[PDB]
């Protein structure tokens, strides 16, 4: 028993992290096969950042402008390309440590693990979720750009995030590895705001299943509810709506604990209106919405 | 900006994790050089656990009783030894992936990263601290035994914890890699209780420095305090006492933010007496004591 914010092992992704320098601007790229993926604003200067025309900045750039450093080796760049907001530096040499990998664009609510890098070197690993506003609450300093979010399906590293931007609040924005931004954000240093940040209800419900399973049970209560009437209440507290899919998803946990989702909804409903009255659940004083139904199943069945 | 519970990269330690089976009982061992370290209760059956005489259980055991499995290889065991509560299986082959390593016994308050394993396979990584009662609040299921806690000093993996036991509460106990238990715990399934779990004050003070640095500043206040008078108050809320060493330790953060420790103590003092009044600090509704002064410096300077 016990329940933690737990990242996948970083080891397989560690092998893929390289430094990418362009003039002054230096940051992290991801090396899979004979291609290094990095944010395209590696090309920009501090001033260029204010309003870049990348197309235009790319004209005065050749393969040899791009310093791909793998720890203390230099990969030869034999091609560069722009795919939405990432550069794809074709290098002579395939990453020998390339894992089985996919690029997936996550939906909001899905969680993934961040391997935070500086100078193309892992500093730390942590979990987080794609909020519904399409930000994440990372920890990221200058030089973190091109650090990646991943999940692992046993053998296979699924890459979902490349880190580009911080927004006032210390929330973060970035791209899939196809370089399409999550949410309405652009790689410019112009005004642009996150929308309302909603709570991921299905994730909060899974957390409570995770709570129950560990023997924190007190929030449980006599009442049941309907999807519709729980939403009437949720909406107000800025919770993502719940759906039959969310319910089907939670089934495993429902089956594990013998507590129908709709019962757990009633339990969660009261906590929304009455708060936690000083108590914790799994040593959290607030309702934790950064666990997928899978995160709990993973951690409470203990899959590897 | 942004601040997370962030584990070191697991990759270097991943290489060291092997399955160890003895009859029925199967769990994780750590493979460095020609030695595999595991909990000694690999030898016990379910019944033996109730009150084992290891010395005595070790008599009816030979090298060949111990199945050291490295993914899908079998390491030959050419020697076994008992060091307090760990076995040391001498094998023919040195782990080629052995990192630069040390074994350190941490003091309580120090944090380290857990790489949670089943069948000698990394399932997940998370940070935690050695509470002052000498428990940790892991997440650990049956098969997790012999999973290790580590820190990294740039090149060098420092191993501080091997996981043995869960206690009612879902708190956990275990050993240094010399197999001496942290705290008064024994590898028997007998009654034995954790002491009072105290809050790690120096760690809470660092968290607030971490808060300040990210622009959560509101808890800051007009008052200063003395070490003595803050303790008079702390004691009551079950906070670890503060010392001149704790103050010298926090200096870097004090210097970073221009806020004397004793000021931060006054700020923390009021929050102890008045609570947080619904507000969060770094999106935590309670005072987080699972960050070393180094954890913040690491994450907020961004060392690798
Ligand atoms: C990134 O380039 C890097 O790590 N290498 C230098 C960097 C990461 C960033 C630094 C602080 N925290 C982080 O996550 N990202 C940037 O420098 C991006 C680049 C240039 C500015 N910028 C920002 O993130 C800026 N944010 C905003 O401009 N904010 C709004 C869009 C809401 C205004 C700063 C102010 C520097 C954080 C672009 C976005 C291409
Ligand atoms: C470990 O052996 C393993 O993972 N491989 C089988 C296992 C880890 C444990 C299972 C549930 N959560 C965990 O962290 N540890 C044990 O089985 C240890 C072994 C045998 C019993 N035991 C316990 O942890 C038991 N706890 C207690 O006995 N509790 C007190 C000492 C306070 C009574 C259980 C009840 C099984 C959790 C010894 C301690 C050698
Ligand atoms: Na970009
Ligand atoms: Na033991």
Numbering used by the authors:
A (entry chain AAA), B (entry chain AAA): 1 to 304
Please, what does the article write about this entry?
The main protease (Mpro) of the betacoronavirus SARS-CoV-2 is an attractive target for the development of treatments for COVID-19. Starting from crystal structures of the Mpro in complexes with the Hepatitis C virus NS3/4A protease inhibitors boceprevir and telaprevir, we optimized the potency of the alpha-ketoamide boceprevir against the Mpro by replacing its P1 cyclobutyl moiety by a γ-lactam as a glutamine surrogate. In line with our original goal of identifying broad-spectrum inhibitors that target the main protease of coronaviruses and the 3C protease of enteroviruses, we also assessed the inhibitory potency of MG-78 against the Mpro of the alphacoronavirus HCoV NL63 and the 3Cpros of enterovirus A71 (EV-A71) and Coxsackievirus B3 (CVB3). Finally, coronavirus Mpros feature a catalytic dyad comprising a Cys…His pair, whereas enterovirus 3Cpros have a catalytic triad consisting of Cys…His…Glu(Asp).
